[PDB]
C-alpha cells in the first residue's frame, strides 16, 4: 500500500514556473513511484545520471527536489554538470558530480500556444555564472558597464529576462521541452523517500 506524494501531479500542470523561477518542491516521507517515469513512460530524453534509471526505487535519497522548467529543445542538453549555454550558467545550474535525474519531454501541446508565451522567460546577462541550485528570482536591470543606471533601461542596463519566442509550429529543437530536474540529495540526514 504505502502512499504516493504528488510527484506525478507537480510533473503535469498547466503552468511550470520559468527557467529562473523554477520551482523548489521538497518531498519527504513518500514512496515516490518512479516506475511510472522509467518502467513505462513516454517521456523522451530520460537521461538520469548519478544512479542508473533501472532499480531506482531500490535507492533511497534524503530529499527529492523536483524541479520545473520550460526550455527550448536545443538547450535541453545544457541541463548537465556545467556544460555550457545560457542554461546552467546564467540559470539553474547542476553541481559537478551531481546526483539526480533529468526528465525532458517535448511539450508542443499542454500550454504552449501561438506567440511567445508571456511566462517561460529566459534569465541571462547576470553579473556572474551563478552557483548550483541557487534560485534566481530577483530581477534587476543588469549592469553591463561601470555607471549604475538608476532603474530604467537603455543601452547596457539590460533587462535580464527574455521571453521564449516559440509557436506551436516551430522546428524540432525549438519546441519547449518541459524538463524536470529531480535533484536527489544524499547527505548526512535520514533517508525518507524509500519503497517500491
Amino acid at each position, epitope marked *: 500500500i504505502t502512499n504516493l506524494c504528488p510527484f506525478g501531479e507537480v510533473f503535469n500542470a498547466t503552468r511550470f514556473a520559468s527557467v529562473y523561477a523554477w520551482n523548489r518542491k521538497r518531498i519527504s516521507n513518500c514512496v515516490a513511484d518512479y516506475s511510472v517515469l522509467y518502467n513505462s513512460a513516454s517521456f523522451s530524453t530520460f537521461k538520469c545520471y548519478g544512479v542508473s534509471p533501472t532499480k531506482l526505487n531500490d535507492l533511497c535519497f534524503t530529499n527529492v527536489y523536483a524541479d520545473s522548467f520550460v526550455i527550448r529543445g536545443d538547450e535541453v542538453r545544457q541541463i548537465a554538470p556545467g556544460q555550457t549555454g545560457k542554461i546552467a550558467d546564467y540559470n539553474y545550474k547542476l553541481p559537478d558530480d551531481f546526483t539526480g535525474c533529468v526528465i525532458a519531454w517535448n511539450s508542443n501541446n499542454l500550454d504552449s500556444k501561438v506567440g511567445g508565451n508571456y511566462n517561460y522567460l529566459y534569465r541571462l546577462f547576470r553579473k556572474s555564472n551563478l552557483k548550483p541550485f541557487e534560485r534566481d528570482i530577483s530581477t534587476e536591470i543588469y549592469q*553591463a558597464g561601470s*555607471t549604475p543606471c538608476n532603474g530604467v533601461e537603455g*543601452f547596457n542596463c*539590460y533587462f535580464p529576462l*527574455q521571453s521564449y519566442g516559440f509557436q506551436p509550429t516551430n522546428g524540432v529543437g525549438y519546441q519547449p521541452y518541459r524538463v524536470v530536474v529531480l535533484s536527489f540529495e544524499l547527505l548526512h540526514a535520514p533517508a525518507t523517500v524509500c519503497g517500491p
Partner: antibody
Amino acid sequence: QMQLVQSGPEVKKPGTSVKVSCKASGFTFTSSAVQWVRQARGQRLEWIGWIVVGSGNTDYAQQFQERVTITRDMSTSTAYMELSSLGSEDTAVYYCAAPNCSGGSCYDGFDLWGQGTMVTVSS
Amino acid sequence: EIVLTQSPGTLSLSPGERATLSCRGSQSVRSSYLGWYQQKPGQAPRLLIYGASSRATGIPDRFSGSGSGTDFTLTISRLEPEDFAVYYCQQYGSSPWTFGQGTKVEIK
C-alpha cells in the same frame, strides 16, 4: 583587435529586401549588444537599429517603422539586419557596432566597429 | 528625436594650440551614457570617450571629455596631426539615440 566583418557591397532593386550580415569574433558575442547605423556619402550617420543578442530586444529609429528588422544568430555569432521596402535614397554603408568586451559583466563603450557594408539601390 | 547642435563644423584646429569640440544636449542628459567616436575619412569610426570617464583608447590622453549635462567638451591640450576626422557625440541613454549633425574637425 576584435574582428567585426560584414558582407561585401550589395546592389538591390529599390523597394526590395536586403540582408546585411555582421559577424563578430574574438570576443563573447552573446553578452554584447549590436548597433546599426547608416552612413551615406557626405551626411553624418544615424540609426538603422540596435539589438541585444541575449535579451531578445530590438529597436530602430522612428523613421524606420515596420521597414527594418534586425535578427540575431548565436549559432554563427552574427547579427543580421533586413531593410524592407528600402527607399531609393537608402544608398549608404550600413555599419554594425558593439562593445569589445568579455565576461558576464563586461565593458560599457562601443569599442569595436564593423568595417561597413556598402548598400546600393540601383536600377 | 534628440538634436545635438555642436560647435560649428569645419572648425580650424592645429597642433600647438588647445582644441575643443562640444555638442549640447537638447535636454540635460545623463553624462555617462554619451560618447564621441570619430570616423576617419573613408573608414569605420572608433570609440574615444564617454561621459569624460575613460581616456581615448588607442589615442594619447591629450583627448579627454569634459562638461556636465548638455554641454560636453573634448579638450585636446595639444592637438595632433593624425586627427583629421569627423567626430560626433553618441547618445545611448534614453531609447532614441541621435547620431548625425556633422561635428567635423580638421587638422591644419
